Write a protein that binds this ligand. Structure first.
Ligand SMILES: CN[C@@H]1[C@@H](O)[C@@H](O[C@@H]2[C@@H](O)[C@H](O[C@H]3O[C@H]([C@@H](C)O)[C@@H](O)[C@H](O)[C@H]3N)[C@@H](N)C[C@H]2N)OC[C@]1(C)O
Ligand SMILES: CN[C@@H]1[C@@H](O)[C@@H](O[C@@H]2[C@@H](O)[C@H](O[C@H]3O[C@H]([C@@H](C)O)[C@@H](O)[C@H](O)[C@H]3N)[C@@H](N)C[C@H]2N)OC[C@]1(C)O
Ligand SMILES: [Mg+2]
Ligand SMILES: [Mg+2]
Ligand SMILES: [Mg+2]
Ligand SMILES: [Mg+2]
Ligand SMILES: [Mg+2]
Ligand SMILES: [Mg+2]
Ligand SMILES: [Mg+2]
Ligand SMILES: [Mg+2]
Ligand SMILES: [Mg+2]
Ligand SMILES: [Mg+2]
Ligand SMILES: [Mg+2]
Ligand SMILES: [Mg+2]
Ligand SMILES: [Mg+2]
Ligand SMILES: [Mg+2]
Ligand SMILES: [Mg+2]
Ligand SMILES: [Mg+2]
Ligand SMILES: [Mg+2]
Ligand SMILES: [Mg+2]
Ligand SMILES: [Mg+2]
Ligand SMILES: [Mg+2]
Ligand SMILES: [Mg+2]
Ligand SMILES: [Mg+2]
Ligand SMILES: [Mg+2]
Ligand SMILES: [Mg+2]
Ligand SMILES: [Mg+2]
Ligand SMILES: [Mg+2]
Ligand SMILES: [Mg+2]
Ligand SMILES: [Mg+2]
Ligand SMILES: [Mg+2]
Ligand SMILES: [Mg+2]
Ligand SMILES: [Mg+2]
Ligand SMILES: [Mg+2]
Ligand SMILES: [Mg+2]
Ligand SMILES: [Mg+2]
Ligand SMILES: [Mg+2]
Ligand SMILES: [Mg+2]
Ligand SMILES: [Mg+2]
Ligand SMILES: [Mg+2]
Ligand SMILES: [Mg+2]
Ligand SMILES: [Mg+2]
Ligand SMILES: [Mg+2]
Ligand SMILES: [Mg+2]
Ligand SMILES: [Mg+2]
Ligand SMILES: [Mg+2]
Ligand SMILES: [Mg+2]
Ligand SMILES: [Mg+2]
Ligand SMILES: [Mg+2]
Ligand SMILES: [Mg+2]
Ligand SMILES: [Mg+2]
Ligand SMILES: [Mg+2]
Ligand SMILES: [Mg+2]
Ligand SMILES: [Mg+2]
Ligand SMILES: [Mg+2]
Ligand SMILES: [Mg+2]
Ligand SMILES: [Mg+2]
Ligand SMILES: [Mg+2]
Ligand SMILES: [Mg+2]
Ligand SMILES: [Mg+2]
Ligand SMILES: [Mg+2]
Ligand SMILES: [Mg+2]
Ligand SMILES: [Mg+2]
Ligand SMILES: [Mg+2]
Ligand SMILES: [Mg+2]
Ligand SMILES: [Mg+2]
Ligand SMILES: [Mg+2]
Ligand SMILES: [Mg+2]
Ligand SMILES: [Mg+2]
Ligand SMILES: [Mg+2]
Ligand SMILES: [Mg+2]
Ligand SMILES: [Mg+2]
Ligand SMILES: [Mg+2]
Ligand SMILES: [Mg+2]
Ligand SMILES: [Mg+2]
Ligand SMILES: [Mg+2]
Ligand SMILES: [Mg+2]
Ligand SMILES: [Mg+2]
Ligand SMILES: [Mg+2]
Ligand SMILES: [Mg+2]
Ligand SMILES: [Mg+2]
Ligand SMILES: [Mg+2]
Ligand SMILES: [Mg+2]
Ligand SMILES: [Mg+2]
Ligand SMILES: [Mg+2]
Ligand SMILES: [Mg+2]
Ligand SMILES: [Mg+2]
Ligand SMILES: [Mg+2]
Ligand SMILES: [Mg+2]
Ligand SMILES: [Mg+2]
Ligand SMILES: [Mg+2]
Ligand SMILES: [Mg+2]
Ligand SMILES: [Mg+2]
Ligand SMILES: [Mg+2]
Ligand SMILES: [Mg+2]
Ligand SMILES: [Mg+2]
Ligand SMILES: [Mg+2]
Ligand SMILES: [Mg+2]
Ligand SMILES: [Mg+2]
Ligand SMILES: [Mg+2]
Ligand SMILES: [Mg+2]
Ligand SMILES: [Mg+2]
Ligand SMILES: [Mg+2]
Ligand SMILES: [Mg+2]
Ligand SMILES: [Mg+2]
Ligand SMILES: [Mg+2]
Ligand SMILES: [Mg+2]
Ligand SMILES: [Mg+2]
Ligand SMILES: [Mg+2]
Ligand SMILES: [Mg+2]
Ligand SMILES: [Mg+2]
Ligand SMILES: [Mg+2]
Ligand SMILES: [Mg+2]
Ligand SMILES: [Mg+2]
Ligand SMILES: [Mg+2]
Ligand SMILES: [Mg+2]
Ligand SMILES: [Mg+2]
Ligand SMILES: [Mg+2]
Ligand SMILES: [Mg+2]
Ligand SMILES: [Mg+2]
Ligand SMILES: [Zn+2]
Lengths: 49, 84, 101, 60, 119
RNA sequence: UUGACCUCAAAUCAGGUAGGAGUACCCGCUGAACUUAAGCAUAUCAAUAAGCGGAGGAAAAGAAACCAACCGGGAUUGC
RNA sequence: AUAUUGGCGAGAGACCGAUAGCGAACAAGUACAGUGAUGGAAAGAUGAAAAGAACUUUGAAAAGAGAGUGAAAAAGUACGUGAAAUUGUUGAAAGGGAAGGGCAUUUGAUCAGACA
RNA sequence: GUCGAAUUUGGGUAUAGGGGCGAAAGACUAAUCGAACCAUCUAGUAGCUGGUUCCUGCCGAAGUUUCCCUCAGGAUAGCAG
RNA sequence: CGUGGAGGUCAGUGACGAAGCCUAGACCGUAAGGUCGGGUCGAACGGCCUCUAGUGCAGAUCUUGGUGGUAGUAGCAAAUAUUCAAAUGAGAACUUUGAAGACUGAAGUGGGGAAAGGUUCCACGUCAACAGCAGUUGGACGUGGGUUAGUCGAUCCUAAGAGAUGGGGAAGCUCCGUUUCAAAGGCCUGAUGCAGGCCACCAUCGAAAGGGAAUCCGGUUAAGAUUCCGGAACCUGGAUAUGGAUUCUUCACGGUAACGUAACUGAAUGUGGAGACGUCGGCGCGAGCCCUGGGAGGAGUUAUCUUUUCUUCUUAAC
RNA sequence: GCUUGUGACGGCCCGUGAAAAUCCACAGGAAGGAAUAGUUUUCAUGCCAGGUCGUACUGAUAACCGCAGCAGGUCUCCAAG
RNA sequence: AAACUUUCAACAACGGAUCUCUUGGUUCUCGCAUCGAUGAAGAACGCAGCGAAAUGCGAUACGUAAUGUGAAUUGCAGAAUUCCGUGAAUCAUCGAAUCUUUGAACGCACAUUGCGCCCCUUGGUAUUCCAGGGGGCAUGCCUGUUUGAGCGUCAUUU
C-alpha cells in the first residue's frame, strides 16, 4: 500500500532489470552471453524487501 | 500446528534494510544491524568468520579512491602537469 | 538447574510495577520554612482513587511561598478528610484530623 | 507533461517552465514513475494554448 | 566535431558561461528529437561538450584562487597537495635534520673520515 | 575605584589533531575446551583458538643495575 | 642482520589439469536458501574462417525432404572426441517354475597358420 | 468443550541459552527444547563398526604362557617370515 | 604387470592420420598385461635404461554425476453442475458472444482495506516453456501504457519503550544513568551591540488502528482519481486597505436575571476549560435501510384472473 | 422492525477504566490611546502563498507465508426479501 | 511360428566417460613500502544512440582535462567526425578536475529522501512570512585569541 520511498525505489531498480537479454548483445565479438541469467519474477523469487 | 498453519502468521519483518551495508539485516526493535553492527563505530567482524570477512573486505567494492594509490605511489606523488 | 521464579523476579522484566493509571507519587510538602517554624494552609480540592492502592488520595493545593502560583501536593487521605477542607501544616499548626505537624 | 529531475519540487519546476518555455503555469501536480523518474503535469494559464506551445518546442 | 579543450582556454569566462547555455539549449533540443527518432548519436558529442566547457570554467577559477593565495601559509585545503595522510604529517626536512647544539659541535669535531688500506 | 595573579570556563574564536579500514608479519590485554594421561581432578593440549587494545615497513629489542668465575668476556636481533 | 597465508610489483615449479586445481578457469562470493548470523552452487572446447545452410518443396508451426557451405554436417550454435549404465530398429540364436558358470564333443558361423 | 469473560484478537514494546519465559507439561523459546540457532576450536577422541584398489612364485601361523582397573584392548614369551 | 610426471637414449611414431573410443577378428604370456587388422577419429605420442609419486577399486548404508526395473503402473474421486448454437482459429469438452440449467445467498463465490507482495493492474502482440487433461484463454511470454492532493495518510505529538549528553563503572569491545551529585539555554520589547523584564522546560527516536487544522457533489480514463475536469467550499501561514463599529462619559450598549450581539484595546504572570477516555442494562431520539398508499413515466403477464408483477421518482460538503 | 449514532439515566468493581503536542477562555492592569480628530485585525469584504514521500492492483480454495496456482494459516468495515 | 524375453553385432538413441587442450588454481623465490576528516574500506542509487550483467564512471556519470602514440572504433547505426594533422581511439599514460545518496559520517534525525538554525544573493511591494541560488553549525583533546566566573587571592584607589 503506502510504502517507504527506499522500498519504492528498490522496487523501480527491480522492474527496470526484469527484461530479456538485449538481442544485439548476442552479435558482439567474443560475446559469451546468451540469455539473461539473473532474471527474476514476482511469483518465483521474492526479493526480500 | 507448530508447522504450516502457524507459519501462516509470518507477516512482520524481523529486520529492515541496513543503511551502511544494505543487507536487510537491520533489526527493527533492536535498531542495529546483524552484519556490520551499524550503528556501531567500527564495522562488525570476527576471525571465525573468514568467509564473511572474505565476503566484505577491501576489494569487493569499487575501491573508488584507493585503486589509483598504487599508481600515485609509483610516480612520487606528482603535482602540476606534463608539458609537450 | 534452571533459574527459579524468585530469582527471575529481580532484574525485573515482566515483573516491574504497573505504573500507568497511577495518580503520581503520594508525598507531603517539602520541609521548608513554612512547616518547621510557622504553619501554612492548603485546601483539599479533590480526593480520588489510586489504581493499585486501596487508600484514596487527596489533591491538596497550597500557595507557593516564594512566587505567585499554586502548587499541588498528593496527600494520602486520612479517614474523614473531605473535598474543600482547609489543611494546616507545620510545627505551630493545630491538632485536627488531616493537618500535619 | 514533462519528465523532471527527482531533486526538483513544484517550485523549481514551475520556475523552469516559465523561463525556458516563456509560458504561465496555472498549477503543477508531480508524481514519481515506477521506473524512478518524476513526471510533471504542468497546466498552462488559459491565456496560452499548450497544443501550440508544444510543437513550438518541437514534439508532436 | 565540437568543443576542443585548448580552444576554450584562450576564451574568457563570461562567454564560456554563455557558450554553455548554448550547449544546454542545444542538448535540450536534441532530447526533444531523440524521442522522435530511432537513432540520435550526435547527442553524445554535445553532452561531452558540456563537460569540456565546465572543465575549463572550473579549471580557470581554480588556478585563479591558487595564485591569489600563493606564497603564504593557509591556502584552502583542496588546493593543497594530496600526498598521503601519513605523508601529510611526516616531520618536515627542516624539523628532521634539526640537530642539538651539543651534537652539531660533535659532527664538526669528528665527522666520518674517508680512509683506506693498502695490502 | 582600577590594575594584576591563580584556578576554572565559554566561542560556528585562530590553526590543528583523533576516530574507521586492513591485519600475513608485530607489541600488549584477555582467555578456553576438545585432546593426551589407555579412567581422572594436578599436569597436557597452551602461556594456543575465540574475544579486546595498539603500531610500522618492518615491530620489538638495544648501549648492561649483562654474562661470567676465565689469561676473562662486553648494546640488541637472527642462524 | 630478523619476521612476513596481507597490499603493490616481478621471475619460476619433476604441482593441478574442469568430480582435479582456490568454493569460483564462465555476468562467483554469482544464482539461491535462510528472520538472522550465516550458508553457498552448478557451469570451459562448432570451425582456419560463420562459410551459421540462399533457393525449392510438405507442413498452421515446430520441423521434415531436397539443395547448399565446409577438409569434415561421422562438426548444424542439442555443436571436438562421444566410453558405460541404459534404449529403438535391423540381423542371428536360444528359450516346459530365473539367468549366468566348469569339463567335453556335435552342429552353425567365422578365422589364423602352414604348404607350395 | 467454552462462548460477555482469568474472553478472543491486531500492532507497538520488554525478556535471549544454564538464559528467558511457564495458571507447572521439562512445557514454550522461528517444523529446533531434559539447554535454541550460527560459526570456529575441529580432520575433537574411539580398546568399537565399515571399507582398504594389479599378478604370480616360495615359506606359512595363532586362539596358549606371564603381568595389566586386564575380561571386545595392550605388553609379554611361543608359533611365522 | 600397469598409471601421472622427471633425467638419458632410439637423429623413435604421426595431418600420406598422433591419442582416444568401437570390434562373440588375429597373435604372444600361467597371469597382471602386450601386439595386430578393420571402424570411428582428429594433434600429438611411444620403446628402452633410470628417476619420482596424489600410481591400479566391485563393495566403505562411500562422494559427484548418469540410468533402469517397478511403469504407461499408484494415481489426476472434498468444495451439488453442467447443457445448446455461433464466432474465431490449422486445431474448441475447456477462449469469446448469444441462448438454457444452476451456485455462492449479503457471517458472499459481492463491494473496500491493514500486514505482505511489488507491476501482478491495463492494452496490444502471443503459445516454446508454465497453468500435474487441453489451450486459440492466463496471474504465462513480448512490447508498451499506466499511480496527478494546502484538505486522504505520512510529516507533528506523546504511550509502554528506546537513547545522546556533564558524568560513574569497565584492560577493552563497552556497562550504567535521562533527570543523571553539570557554569546546560532561550523568548519577546524596544531605547545592532546595548538598557531591560523575564521564562527558564537540558536532547532525541518511539503510533499509516491513540491525539490531531481543512472538501464536497457531478463528470471523466483501457488502466488514476475525496488527487483529474466543472462548480461549489474550508484551513493554515503571510500581506495590507475600504466600509462598518468605537470615542468629546475614551477602551459598546441592551436585559431585573440566566443571557444578548456584527464588532466592542491587553504585555507578562497566573489560572481555568475543552485534547481526555471502563463496561454492561433498559428507555428516548436522529440518520441509512426495510415495509407501504396516491399519482406521473418505462418494463412483464394476460385461454382464463389480477384498478396486477417489476422498476425511475434523487439532493454534497459549505 | 434492522443497523448505526447519540442523549438522559441505571448496574458494576480490594478493577473506577492513558499521556503529550495543540486551540480557547478567564483573572489580571503593564503599557498605549480622541476632538479638528484618534484608537480598533476575534464584525464584513478584499490580495499573495501551501512544499516533500505514498496513491496502480491483490488482499487470498491462484497476487501474503506454508518448497507450489498447497482442502492449511493471516487483522477489519459495509450487509436486502 | 510369431509376440515376448535374453545374448552378440551395426546403425540410431541416452548420457558426458576418455583423449587432447588451458588467459585458471597452486606452491617456491625475488623486489617494493602506499588507505583514511584533503571524507578511507563499504554501501545504495544512477550514467550508454541502442545493456539485463560483468567491468567502468558519477547529474562534466562505459566518462571531462592533461601527456604520449599516431589512425582507428566495430554487434548494427553513426559521425560541419578529420588523416603530411595540437590528430582517430573503449589505445596506452595520468601530474588536472568532477565525484549523486551515503558511510569512522559531523546541524537533528533516519522502518521518514522527515525536521531545524546562522551568513551572502535573487524574486514576490519586505531585516521579519514565502521561494529560488550559492555558503555554513558533530565530539574529545593540544597551542593561541577574545570574552568571562569565584572573599581562591595580591596590590590600589577616597
Ligand atoms: C540366450 N538367453 C537364454 C538362452 O541361453 C536359453 O537358455 C537356456 C535354457 O532355456 C535352458 O533350458 C532350461 O531353462 C529353461 C528356462 C526358461 O528357465 C527352463 O524352462 C527349462 O526347464 C530348462 N531345461 C537351460 N538349461 C540353459 C540355457 N542356455 O534360452 C533363452 C534364454 C533363457 O533367454
Ligand atoms: C563528599 N561526599 C559527598 C558524596 O558522598 C556524594 O553524596 C551523594 C549526594 O550528592 C546525593 O545528592 C544529590 O544527588 C541525588 C541523586 C541520587 O539523584 C539527588 O537526588 C539529590 O537531590 C542531590 N542533592 C545523594 N542523594 C546521594 C549521596 N551519596 O556527593 C556529594 C558529596 C558532598 O560530594
Ligand atoms: Mg573462444
Ligand atoms: Mg570463434
Ligand atoms: Mg522461498
Ligand atoms: Mg524468505
Ligand atoms: Mg521484507
Ligand atoms: Mg502473530
Ligand atoms: Mg521482534
Ligand atoms: Mg540475502
Ligand atoms: Mg565463515
Ligand atoms: Mg615527483
Ligand atoms: Mg515502572
Ligand atoms: Mg504527489
Ligand atoms: Mg510528490
Ligand atoms: Mg579548501
Ligand atoms: Mg601505513
Ligand atoms: Mg576555530
Ligand atoms: Mg585503530
Ligand atoms: Mg590470565
Ligand atoms: Mg587435536
Ligand atoms: Mg583422557
Ligand atoms: Mg581413551
Ligand atoms: Mg587472537
Ligand atoms: Mg628490511
Ligand atoms: Mg624500532
Ligand atoms: Mg649506560
Ligand atoms: Mg652479548
Ligand atoms: Mg603477487
Ligand atoms: Mg572444479
Ligand atoms: Mg567446485
Ligand atoms: Mg525453515
Ligand atoms: Mg580450446
Ligand atoms: Mg573457437
Ligand atoms: Mg534440411
Ligand atoms: Mg570429422
Ligand atoms: Mg555433406
Ligand atoms: Mg561420433
Ligand atoms: Mg567435429
Ligand atoms: Mg545428447
Ligand atoms: Mg558431436
Ligand atoms: Mg551400450
Ligand atoms: Mg510359465
Ligand atoms: Mg539355476
Ligand atoms: Mg518372469
Ligand atoms: Mg552348459
Ligand atoms: Mg447472550
Ligand atoms: Mg495482542
Ligand atoms: Mg485483530
Ligand atoms: Mg513491532
Ligand atoms: Mg541455570
Ligand atoms: Mg541475566
Ligand atoms: Mg518449536
Ligand atoms: Mg574393549
Ligand atoms: Mg568383534
Ligand atoms: Mg601426480
Ligand atoms: Mg562387446
Ligand atoms: Mg585406423
Ligand atoms: Mg587411430
Ligand atoms: Mg585440431
Ligand atoms: Mg589414490
Ligand atoms: Mg576408478
Ligand atoms: Mg563403481
Ligand atoms: Mg574388494
Ligand atoms: Mg528411480
Ligand atoms: Mg522413469
Ligand atoms: Mg501415458
Ligand atoms: Mg491411461
Ligand atoms: Mg491408471
Ligand atoms: Mg484419492
Ligand atoms: Mg470456419
Ligand atoms: Mg467444435
Ligand atoms: Mg471445463
Ligand atoms: Mg441458493
Ligand atoms: Mg476496489
Ligand atoms: Mg482492492
Ligand atoms: Mg492478451
Ligand atoms: Mg499441461
Ligand atoms: Mg501444453
Ligand atoms: Mg487480467
Ligand atoms: Mg505481461
Ligand atoms: Mg500534502
Ligand atoms: Mg514522534
Ligand atoms: Mg545509555
Ligand atoms: Mg554523558
Ligand atoms: Mg561520559
Ligand atoms: Mg493516526
Ligand atoms: Mg477529506
Ligand atoms: Mg492517467
Ligand atoms: Mg479502479
Ligand atoms: Mg450602535
Ligand atoms: Mg485513549
Ligand atoms: Mg385475459
Ligand atoms: Mg466539511
Ligand atoms: Mg455508568
Ligand atoms: Mg495562541
Ligand atoms: Mg488569545
Ligand atoms: Mg516601567
Ligand atoms: Mg490509488
Ligand atoms: Mg485504489
Ligand atoms: Mg487494490
Ligand atoms: Mg477482504
Ligand atoms: Mg474481499
Ligand atoms: Mg509463496
Ligand atoms: Mg520360437
Ligand atoms: Mg552410439
Ligand atoms: Mg584457455
Ligand atoms: Mg566522496
Ligand atoms: Mg561495456
Ligand atoms: Mg590527444
Ligand atoms: Mg584508458
Ligand atoms: Mg606511459
Ligand atoms: Mg558536477
Ligand atoms: Mg548523525
Ligand atoms: Mg522522498
Ligand atoms: Mg529518509
Ligand atoms: Mg527579501
Ligand atoms: Mg524561511
Ligand atoms: Mg569541529
Ligand atoms: Mg575539532
Ligand atoms: Zn549493516
Amino acid at each position: 500500500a503506502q510504502k517507504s520511498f527506499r522500498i519504492k525505489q528498490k522496487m523501480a531498480k527491480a522492474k527496470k532489470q526484469n527484461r530479456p537479454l538485449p538481442q544485439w548483445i548476442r552479435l558482439r565479438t567474443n560475446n559469451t552471453i546468451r540469455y539473461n541469467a539473473k532474471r527474476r519474477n514476482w511469483r518465483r523469487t521474492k526479493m526480500n524487501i | 500446528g507448530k508447522g504450516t498453519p502457524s507459519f501462516g502468521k509470518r507477516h512482520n519483518k524481523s529486520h529492515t534494510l541496513c543503511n551502511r551495508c544494505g543487507r536487510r539485516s537491520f533489526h527493527v526493535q533492536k535498531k542495529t544491524c546483524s552484519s556490520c553492527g551499524y550503528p556501531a563505530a567500527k564495522t562488525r567482524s570476527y576471525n571465525w568468520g573468514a568467509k564473511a570477512k572474505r565476503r566484505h573486505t577491501t576489494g569487493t567494492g569499487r575501491m573508488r579512491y584507493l585503486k589509483h594509490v598504487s599508481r600515485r605511489f609509483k610516480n612520487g606523488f606528482q603535482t602540476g602537469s606534463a608539458s609537450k | 538447574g534452571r533459574v527459579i521464579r524468585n530469582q527471575r523476579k529481580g532484574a525485573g522484566s515482566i515483573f516491574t510495577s504497573h505504573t500507568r493509571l497511577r495518580q503520581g507519587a503520594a508525598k507531603l510538602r517539602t520541609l521548608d520554612y513554612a512547616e518547621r517554624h510557622g504553619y501554612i494552609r492548603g485546601i483539599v480540592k479533590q480526593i480520588v482513587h489510586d489504581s493499585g492502592r486501596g487508600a484514596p488520595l487527596a489533591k491538596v493545593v497550597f500557595r507557593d511561598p516564594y512566587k505567585y502560583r499554586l502548587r499541588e501536593e498528593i496527600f494520602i487521605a486520612n479517614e474523614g478528610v473531605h473535598t474543600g477542607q482547609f489543611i494546616y501544616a507545620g510545627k505551630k499548626a493545630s491538632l485536627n484530623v488531616g493537618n500535619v505537624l | 507533461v514533462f519528465q523532471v529531475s527527482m531533486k526538483a519540487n513544484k517550485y523549481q519546476i514551475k520556475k523552469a517552465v516559465k523561463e525556458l518555455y516563456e509560458v504561465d503555469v496555472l498549477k503543477v501536480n508531480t508524481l514519481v514513475r515506477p521506473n524512478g523518474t518524476k513526471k510533471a503535469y504542468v497546466r498552462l494559464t488559459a491565456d496560452y494554448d499548450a497544443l501550440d506551445i508544444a510543437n513550438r518546442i518541437g514534439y508532436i | 566535431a565540437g568543443v576542443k579543450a585548448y580552444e576554450l582556454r584562450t576564451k574568457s569566462k563570461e562567454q564560456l558561461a554563455s557558450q554553455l547555455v548554448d550547449l544546454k539549449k542545444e542538448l535540450a533540443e536534441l532530447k526533444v528529437q531523440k524521442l522522435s527518432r530511432p537513432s540520435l548519436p550526435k547527442i553524445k558529442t554535445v553532452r561531452k561538450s558540456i563537460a569540456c566547457v565546465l572543465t575549463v570554467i572550473n579549471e580557470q577559477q581554480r588556478e585563479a584562487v591558487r595564485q591569489l593565495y600563493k606564497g603564504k601559509k593557509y591556502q584552502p585545503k583542496d588546493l593543497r597537495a594530496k600526498k598521503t595522510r601519513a605523508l601529510r604529517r611526516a616531520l618536515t626536512k627542516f624539523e628532521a635534520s634539526q640537530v642539538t647544539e651539543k651534537q652539531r659541535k660533535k659532527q664538526i669535531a669528528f665527522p666520518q673520515r674517508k680512509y683506506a688500506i693498502k695490502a
